[PDB]
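The passage that follows is intended for readers who have already worked through the single-chain material. We present the inputs for a multi-component assembly, then the predicted structure in tokenized form, and finally a short commentary. You are encouraged to pause after the input and sketch how you expect the pieces to fit together before reading on.
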Amino acid sequence: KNEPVLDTDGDELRAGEQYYVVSAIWGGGGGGLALGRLTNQQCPEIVVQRRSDLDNGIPVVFYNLDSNDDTVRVSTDLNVEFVPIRDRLCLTSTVWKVDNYDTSTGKWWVTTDGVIGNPGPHTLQSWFKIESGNLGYKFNFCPSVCESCITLCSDIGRYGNDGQMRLALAESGWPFVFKKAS
Amino acid sequence: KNEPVLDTDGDELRAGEQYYVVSAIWGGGGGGLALGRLTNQQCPEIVVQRRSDLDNGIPVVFYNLDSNDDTVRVSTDLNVEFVPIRDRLCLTSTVWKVDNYDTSTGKWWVTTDGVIGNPGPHTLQSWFKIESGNLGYKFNFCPSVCESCITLCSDIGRYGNDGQMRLALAESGWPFVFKKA
Amino acid sequence: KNEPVLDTDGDELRAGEQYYVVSAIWGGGGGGLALGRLTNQQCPEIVVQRRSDLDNGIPVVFYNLDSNDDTVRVSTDLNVEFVPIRDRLCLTSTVWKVDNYDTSTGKWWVTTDGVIGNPGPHTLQSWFKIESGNLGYKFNFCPSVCESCITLCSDIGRYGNDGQMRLALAESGWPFVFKKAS
Amino acid sequence: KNEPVLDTDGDELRAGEQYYVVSAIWGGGGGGLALGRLTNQQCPEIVVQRRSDLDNGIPVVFYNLDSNDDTVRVSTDLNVEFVPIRDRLCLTSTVWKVDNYDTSTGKWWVTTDGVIGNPGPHTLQSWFKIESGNLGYKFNFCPSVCESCITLCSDIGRYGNDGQMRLALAESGWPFVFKKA
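Having made your guess, compare it with the prediction:
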């Protein structure tokens, strides 16, 4: 099988365990990932990166394709879900998913209201991979859960949008590391 | 557009919504802000800080330059208004404003009886910015609503006055966080 | 019997219980009391007040004249002793004591290397009273443990010396409150 | 004379004694300071901050203007020098100094190869002050050693560079505390 993803302690990532997704860069790297909103949309919430290094954001859990695999490995399709500490107003899910194309910017943003499990055409937009990079791990959207589906296939970068640093498909991915939220 | 200010849950501040303004440094750093009075002046009320770090104080609401903008963002002039948790006594508003110079102390205090809206020279003293701090956020008085006006331009810090902890212009601002009320 | 001294919770002070001695003034009031040194004297350490509101200093305990009185009351002679949280280099005690007259400043400072117990002429300089003031409690040095002794009789104020806020006999005392340390 | 700087035990800093310089804000605020190297520059070593708040870095010593003054006090020009816990490659000193302006970033970095003593125009870049922060202490570069010299005058903050956390002149200083080494 593929190499396990490791956290900042060097331990292998476990499916269902909570991790902050924090910038790999030390010095001007920013904080962790979390939830935000847009001017014209309160729900679903979008994925943003904190500007402050002090703020690790909201933890995520990862779920594997097969719930009998407890280890999170590189280059395998996963679900990603924020675990907010307090209840949220939005009724949409906090599962990551690729958004519909944004004609105002030309970007495919990462949003939420994704779905956990049921790999196939219905959930195609909710499957992400974690890949090794030079500066740290990167997310990649290139699902293999529906062989006959036509799909985008691209690393996940970061881009500013109306004062918030969002995640979007990009040629080169932004590097992250994973820190135990325990 | 500028970075949205966030509350302690991580959600952007919304214009018109109530927030406690609470010291980002607890313990002897105190608690939240509130309306107060002075020994020699019942009205207008002044801006004070509660000593107990368990006391969130009295919430404020923020108003943007343009009432169509609902996100409160850093480095933008806004109005700050206490929710009027007070007796029926003062006819003055609960809107923050920079006072006239205090010859007894050398301080430029934050007080109330400010005004909402009408950006320009008439309301210049009622416009405050929220800026990112080392931790939390700090207030800064440096209005740009009147390009030709000469203005003070300074962070907001804390100073003792009349046996109380007040807010005044200071070289280095005191950090606060914003809690949903 | 004299009124009990109360802590910031409204509870009566107990002999031998640890309290921070913090400035009663909120706004430009400074922090708590602790120990310092002088340029020409490392031991005994001197009593100072922290400039920073955030620093409650070192807690003290109070001891009564009679070890069988558990309540600390106003206008009664007490011993005051810092309880440092870690061992200190000086071999002198951390019990408060009025110093010998300082010809360099004209002040009678509060220093340490005091003694606990044995009220009378030998320990006279180690006895302090707590009094109600306008703005909080104040310390008063006016011991009655030796009726035939001539003694100074004055409130304890604060006064700067060598960049430190020291305590000294003064016409008007500095107000304090007592905050449970544990 | 000025207020003595205190270490994390509450004891005044002594000139010539070793101290770790550790961020007053932990977690994502980082750990202590250390000697570092740039990708493209082995010497002089630069001043960096460790990411782990468990890593105290390596100690500095402070030298006063007058060798007869043993207390380190706020708002006074001093020299800062890392204990030379390093390999023997560099002939440069471990004394902190403000660098020449960096056109690639717009920053005035803190680097080493400073000089101890001889206050005046020749050593101007090697004099720093320790100032009280909202919490802990901040460094400030605003030398008074050469009255006729024109000098920068600014707090010291932190900034990323070359994949590392460096110190540079900044509007608002980053707060540190001092731990006996």
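Commentary: Chain D touches chain C through 13 residues (CB under 8 Å). Residues 19-180 of chain D form a domain with the Trefoil (Acidic Fibroblast Growth Factor, subunit A) fold (CATH 2.80.10.50). How closely did your sketch match?
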